[PDB]
Ligand binder design. Sequence first.
Ligand SMILES: NC(=[NH2+])NC/C=C/[C@H]1O[C@@H](n2cnc3c(N)ncnc32)[C@H](O)[C@@H]1O
Ligand SMILES: NC(=[NH2+])NC/C=C/[C@H]1O[C@@H](n2cnc3c(N)ncnc32)[C@H](O)[C@@H]1O
Ligand SMILES: NC(=[NH2+])NC/C=C/[C@H]1O[C@@H](n2cnc3c(N)ncnc32)[C@H](O)[C@@H]1O
Ligand SMILES: NC(=[NH2+])NC/C=C/[C@H]1O[C@@H](n2cnc3c(N)ncnc32)[C@H](O)[C@@H]1O
Lengths: 342, 342, 343, 343
Amino acid sequence: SVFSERTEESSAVQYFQFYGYLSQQQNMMQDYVRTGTYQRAILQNHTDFKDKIVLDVGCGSGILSFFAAQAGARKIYAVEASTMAQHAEVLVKSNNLTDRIVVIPGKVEEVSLPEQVDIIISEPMGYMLFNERMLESYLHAKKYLKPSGNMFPTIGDVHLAPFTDEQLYMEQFTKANFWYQPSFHGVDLSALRGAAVDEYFRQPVVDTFDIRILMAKSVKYTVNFLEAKEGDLHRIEIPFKFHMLHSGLVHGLAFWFDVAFIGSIMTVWLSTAPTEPLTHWYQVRCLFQSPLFAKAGDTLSGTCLLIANKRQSYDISIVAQVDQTGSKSSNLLDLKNPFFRY
Amino acid sequence: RSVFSERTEESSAVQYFQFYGYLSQQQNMMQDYVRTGTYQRAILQNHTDFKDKIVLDVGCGSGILSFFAAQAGARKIYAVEASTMAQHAEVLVKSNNLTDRIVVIPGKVEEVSLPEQVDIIISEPMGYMLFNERMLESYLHAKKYLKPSGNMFPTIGDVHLAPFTDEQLYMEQFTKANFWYQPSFHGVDLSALRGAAVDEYFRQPVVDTFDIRILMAKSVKYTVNFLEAKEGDLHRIEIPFKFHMLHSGLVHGLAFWFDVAFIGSIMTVWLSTAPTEPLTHWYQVRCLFQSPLFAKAGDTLSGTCLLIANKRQSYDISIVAQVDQTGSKSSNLLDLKNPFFR
Amino acid sequence: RSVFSERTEESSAVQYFQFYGYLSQQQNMMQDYVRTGTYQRAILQNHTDFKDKIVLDVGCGSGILSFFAAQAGARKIYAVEASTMAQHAEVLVKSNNLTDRIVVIPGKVEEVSLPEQVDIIISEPMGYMLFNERMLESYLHAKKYLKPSGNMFPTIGDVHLAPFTDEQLYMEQFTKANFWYQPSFHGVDLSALRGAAVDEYFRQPVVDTFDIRILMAKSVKYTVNFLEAKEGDLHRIEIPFKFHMLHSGLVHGLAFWFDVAFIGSIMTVWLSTAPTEPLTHWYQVRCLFQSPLFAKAGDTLSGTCLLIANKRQSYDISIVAQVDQTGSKSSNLLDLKNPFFRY
Amino acid sequence: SVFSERTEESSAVQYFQFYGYLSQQQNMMQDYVRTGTYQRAILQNHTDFKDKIVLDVGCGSGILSFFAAQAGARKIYAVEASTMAQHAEVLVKSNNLTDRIVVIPGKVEEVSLPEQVDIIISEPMGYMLFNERMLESYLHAKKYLKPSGNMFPTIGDVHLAPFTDEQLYMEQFTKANFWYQPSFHGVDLSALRGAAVDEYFRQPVVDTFDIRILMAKSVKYTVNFLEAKEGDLHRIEIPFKFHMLHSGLVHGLAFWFDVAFIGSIMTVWLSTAPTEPLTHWYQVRCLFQSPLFAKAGDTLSGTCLLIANKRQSYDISIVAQVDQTGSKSSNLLDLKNPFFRYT
Ligand SMILES: NC(=[NH2+])NC/C=C/[C@H]1O[C@@H](n2cnc3c(N)ncnc32)[C@H](O)[C@@H]1O
Ligand SMILES: NC(=[NH2+])NC/C=C/[C@H]1O[C@@H](n2cnc3c(N)ncnc32)[C@H](O)[C@@H]1O
Ligand SMILES: NC(=[NH2+])NC/C=C/[C@H]1O[C@@H](n2cnc3c(N)ncnc32)[C@H](O)[C@@H]1O
Ligand SMILES: NC(=[NH2+])NC/C=C/[C@H]1O[C@@H](n2cnc3c(N)ncnc32)[C@H](O)[C@@H]1O
């Protein structure tokens, strides 16, 4: 299958084992912003669901399928690959919706669905929007979508902005310098200090932060899920030119994302921005190997290149330059193994 | 086909050795001064057991125990390590000018070849609750390389079990599970899954420390003699217990910790993770009952802790305990692989 | 075949009036100084409403309110009381030399025969949550004796309710029910009764006081006008509510208190059992949801509190609450007759 | 029936409503001395149960029936008059014992049993042993007992002893002196002081105490359940001669009880004495209206007469005199309404 060809078995096993836990479902459900916004987008756009056929991709415990039922869908196909599909079935039964919701256990790339649907709903977003590569499964499912169908979410915007955080930058070295001693219990560890530094720097930092560390308005990269093909997510080249609003040292790029549900009655936004209430997605920061000085009014130009890998994630390649000075830096990070700093 | 691969799912092995490839993890273990300081003391205080001897270090990591063996005068130390850390260990060997005494052998101890038999084996095979990671079997397996009258550091492992009271912890885990009692979460009835939730939430061993005054009886000791034990002895571990209750009250579960002894020629050195001792990175482990038991002082609490090794490098744990005088009985199942760090 | 006996189980009445035959209970009520002092202020500051008037004291107990009416100048006071406390009332009337003004008439106000119509009715008909004991219906029934131009003290009653958060209270009640989850209590599996236990423990309204900071919205007010209301109006009491949540968090239930006003000719005197006021022997009352509701500040919490009168001189309470934006809904049935005294 | 003939309906309705609560079952079950001693008595005398027919009188949630089953009984008829019988039935089913335990809802004086039984088990003891008058129901059940039959408990011993407790005595007047004031909000209450005193003294005091307040070795009155008849419990006369071990003022009599399960293997005792761990029965004290001075070596003689009433309890009459001085005191108390003093 398309899933198998693009995913290492070892990664897939652990991934779906992780989502087999009710505790992870509770963590997602207890995010009020997430759950409430999904509910609001579906119910306030009830004409997009009433008497429609719906496909729910990666339904987990089934919550979005229930919301689609509340809005009056005629039939909902709920697809889930983890063992959570068992529990979703229990809820479908216990909520007396077996006549309207059918749970299909398996990967959406592999299951057989009988008919074309009117709308696909899903929560495919990971860290930095793209982590887990579930957006590809979501787009792959469009093989079941009628030509005039819709997607909830309809678009996703990843946002990038330069930040200054001297303490975050220094912290890497404080930790790595553990290795810089000539006699740790009689052992000279200093030869590994460089390796330790590199290792810390390859890890995106998952946590939140004061918006006052941001030095420029974000750059936006938009994926239109109604137009995109799944192949469009294998390589994501995000050019940027930031107009510096503040003068200082730039230590890296901060990432967050929004998605929009564009229905017939209204458009509803779900944002993970640092200006908004915190979510279980937090935000993500990637450090440069060296900070860049930029005056207010300078331009910081470069690219963020995301290269998908077989571990259901991305390698992040970042290059940045201060145009007015020519000062340049970069980093290459592994999104599969972020550092949870929060 | 090897002993390791036959008892281990590839998926589990991949993530396991990936985890131990990280220098940040080596640092976390090394910075446990109780652990590191006690190992050095055990080896240097028993320098005669190493002086001009051939040594095997099982799962050497960055090699710190090999370096202790070298300080103690070992003629030759074979340092076996299956993760990519083995290459970092070789870098330290070279930078400490010990190429003449420490020889890194990359790979699994169940699969590599050694040129000769050794006089003593050293390792840190202890995981959480002693047995997690199933490294003790690799440790015992390496005895195929041990000369008939060879030694092992550590020489023995003591598992301690004792009943505890902690209503706060118990209701902490009950509060989490009650989420799945909701009859209308955003209009959805979750109550059918309440049973599954409690089961899942109570399968988690609780990792943290506690005040010794929560213990309700003197501990029971289960000893593993690593000189005598065979690998197969650890596939199914049945630990009987009979506690003489010292205080009346609710027993919410069993607390676990372990000691290991290094029985050398000069002296015996103990490494303890007991709640009476300085805290280590192993902390202590508590297994909750789904329903507490009441016992009065002078009563006896009897039963079995059953550990079945699984193919995920861990154990499925079965605890059954009853108050002998009343027949009040509790029985819980735990997944040692996935604890709750508190 | 009186109105009282028609709406009341004999077993309930016997115990009810036996309870109120105890002097120790009269002492408890009288020693509530907010209560006794406010009643005296309402009556004496409005003395013109009593001076040379005919008074009916409904459920007079030891007679304290009748003595206040006599202090205010009442020409004649009929003090009706159905418990054996009527006899102690008579003793106090004689020892206080008020035999020419206070006339104890033993019996139920629904069954006695009064010699004439009265200018004003006085009583303390309020139980826990205001409505417990169904004494308000006896109070209203007594209006058959009230002149058209007549007054009632208290004149109106305001029920207040507001959502609260209190995880510790919620946890206390579940810790109690956890007992019936045991799969082997002395070798017996109890767990089949765990549902029944939770229902029973959460049926208990909680009587005690609390910090006003646990309240998550402005209270809603339900007003009963005693001059206007009819007995039949209290058989089914439906209180709709819509709260504008001022704080985010889990709502564990609704808190209840009441105010009564004495609307006299000279001034209105208020007696409040609100948690912002000095504690009374009424305290405050909290009804727990079996499952808490989450709401954010700005959301609205709407639903109904429905009280259905029963033949044990109390009400069967049903509360349904729903977060309007999410449809998160919770309900509970409470037995007002038998509260949990937590104080 | 025999039950309805000796019990007022109003009392019976409240009584069985009370025992309908799972919270009350939980309360009794959590008394470990109580629950544990019954289990011990039954299990350690397994030969009185193994393959036998059993009747459990007032089984409540059914716990004693399950112990009889654990001891190997062939068949247990469990009789319970409250709605708790519905919960017992649930437990029998969920515990897979429907083949061995038959729940029979109803009063034991009114149900029919299909066969005679080898042994009757019950927990009929109330405060001061006799409160609730369930011992009569227990004795009544002997119409179903075979001539060899045994009874668990087999005998009941009521103990009584004189005590001194100056502070408990003075407490009564401290409370009653509320009424001794000439202007409570303008009202002279003093005429009711005597009635208030009398009311406090008619209440037996339920709590525990230090054994050092006892002034003499207890006197024991024994009910043998194998021999006693129902009628024997309608009038209980307990004579006493106390030989005073200490000099001081005697403020009343203290009561507690033991029961023995006299089985074929051994006799097990359940005691509520102040020398033993506390139970939910506590101990009971009945004050004298006036204390009696006795010297060490003096004799305190008199009678404790218990007279059954139709409220499922007893009127208590105690008369005592000091033989060497002729000094005399008495009291009349109402066991149905004790003062719970324990803190
Ligand atoms: N936080 C998040 N929302 N993370 C992403 C959400 C992942 C959810 O979707 C499921 N899922 C992921 N890929 C799938 C596929 N190919 N077919 C079917 N179900 C799939 C996961 O098991 C989980 O329940
Ligand atoms: N807390 C701890 N001390 N945990 C255990 C420590 C295990 C260490 O030994 C290595 N290891 C585990 N199993 C092995 C095997 N079969 N052959 C070779 N190396 C192995 C791990 O990669 C890690 O460095
Ligand atoms: N705490 C309180 N204020 N409780 C309410 C007040 C109850 C008082 O009024 C009496 N009472 C109740 N219903 C009555 C009726 N139908 N006729 C005559 N007297 C009656 C009670 O015996 C008690 O003295
Ligand atoms: N703490 C205690 N041991 N209290 C006494 C125990 C009383 C128990 O016996 C029941 N009971 C009382 N009289 C009964 C009768 N005549 N027939 C059947 N069941 C009856 C009560 O409902 C309660 O469950």
